[PDB]
Amino acid sequence: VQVVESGGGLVQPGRSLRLSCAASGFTFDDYAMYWVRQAPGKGLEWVSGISWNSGSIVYADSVKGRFTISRDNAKNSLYLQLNSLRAEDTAFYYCAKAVSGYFPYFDYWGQGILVTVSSASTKGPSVFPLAPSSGGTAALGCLVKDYFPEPVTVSWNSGALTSGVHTFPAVLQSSGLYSLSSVVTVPSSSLGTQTYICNVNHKPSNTKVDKRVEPK
């Protein structure tokens, strides 16, 4: 089973956006397709639903007249057209799937697509080392400062280092830009013997930065 999510990112109020999940490995026309959204920090909201053959279409009141759900069973694709977007529509949009009336319980396929509705301009993150000093445990990290919108992804040594890592939730500063740190604890003895690099990616500003982090 393989899924490809696309659309999403920054869009200004009133403008429009087209989300899609596409999938292979399940019988695409055996299922009613749904969109669920989650405004960041808040809870799940049923948005839209569509029968296997596009026969019946249902929208939640919050989106009726603005959003259009559709599907192409030939292209194994589920679409959501977001028009007349407003700040409150900012959310992670998830693709969901139910067999029939006899079992209408959601299966979620695909990890969610972040839509940020804002007038604010994109700005790439400044990536700065958090250098380790001089029981035998040392912390080091990356400061990913002054970016917009969400999100950024941070890995270490291109995914080779996952053990010990804490990538802090973004916090909005008074400037109207996000900032976070990603840190990792490692043995002291390893500090000189091993290489440590943050892989910061920020799709909205087209910023890929690999920052080396070394003592001092």
Binding site: V36, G43, L44, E45, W46, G49, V58, A60, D61, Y94, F103, P104, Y105, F106, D107, Y108, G110, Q111, G112, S126, F128, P129, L130, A131, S133, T137, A139, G141, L143, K145, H166, F168, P169, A170, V171, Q173, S179, L180, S181, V183, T185
Partner: protein, 219 residues
């Protein structure tokens, strides 16, 4: 349209102990026709989509461990976790399918209670690279501690700071059931270069007395 209301809004239960979450529907979701409750329970771990735990109010999904059970009928339902494990930390949602839109509960944050663990404290001076931009960010890290409550004091030459720092906290770990916290002190290059001693003082329940980490500007 039917309205789901969970209770409590959040819940903190010790390892190996019962956790009970309640869901209530504005109308009944029992279908008299087939005598089935159109009511599911979902788990949502941080930065993942929801996983189905329990359907028809009391039928457990395959893969879902024994300790998860559903109960109730009509308008009052109960998700129960009989012997809570570290990995059960998540937000639990009830969802009704008697109508469509198939509306959700507001959600219930479940936290794991464990023996107090003291934070490892580390301090980080601003990078030479950052200073060239004209602001300075000093970062204090409290690593792998329980419970979530901690006091972080910023001291610039023994002067206690206020309104110039921001905290971020990790989602609770699914293995050791601890948190980590980052305090970020933000000042201008000017103010950073005036003063010499930068110190972060941590008060936490797992420490007999406040721990302080500090540096002098330029080693």
């Amino acid at each position: 349209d039917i309205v789901m209301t969970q209770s409590p809004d959040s819940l903190s239960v010790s390892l190996g102990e019962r956790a009970t979450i309640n869901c209530k529907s504005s109308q009944s979701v029992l279908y008299s026709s087939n005598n089935k409750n159109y009511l599911g329970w979902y788990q949502q771990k941080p930065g993942q989509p929801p996983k189905l735990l329990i359907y028809w109010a009391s039928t457990r999904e395959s893969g879902v461990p024994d300790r998860f059970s559903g109960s109730g009928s009509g308008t009052d339902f109960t998700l129960t976790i009989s012997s809570l494990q570290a990995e059960d930390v998540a937000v639990y949602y009830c969802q009704q399918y008697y109508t469509t839109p198939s509306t959700f509960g507001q959600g219930t944050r479940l936290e794991i209670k464990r023996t107090a663990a003291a934070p490892s404290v580390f301090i980080f001076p601003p990078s030479d690279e950052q200073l060239k931009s004209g602001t300075a960010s000093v970062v204090c890290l409290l690593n792998n501690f329980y419970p979530r409550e901690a006091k972080v004091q910023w001291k610039v030459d023994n002067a206690l700071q206020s309104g110039n720092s921001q905290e971020s906290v990790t989602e609770q770990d699914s293995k050791d059931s601890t948190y980590s916290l980052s305090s970020t002190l933000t000042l201008s290059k000017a103010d950073y270069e005036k003063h010499k001693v930068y110190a972060c003082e941590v008060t936490h329940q797992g420490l007999s007395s406040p721990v302080t980490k500090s540096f002098n500007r330029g080693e």
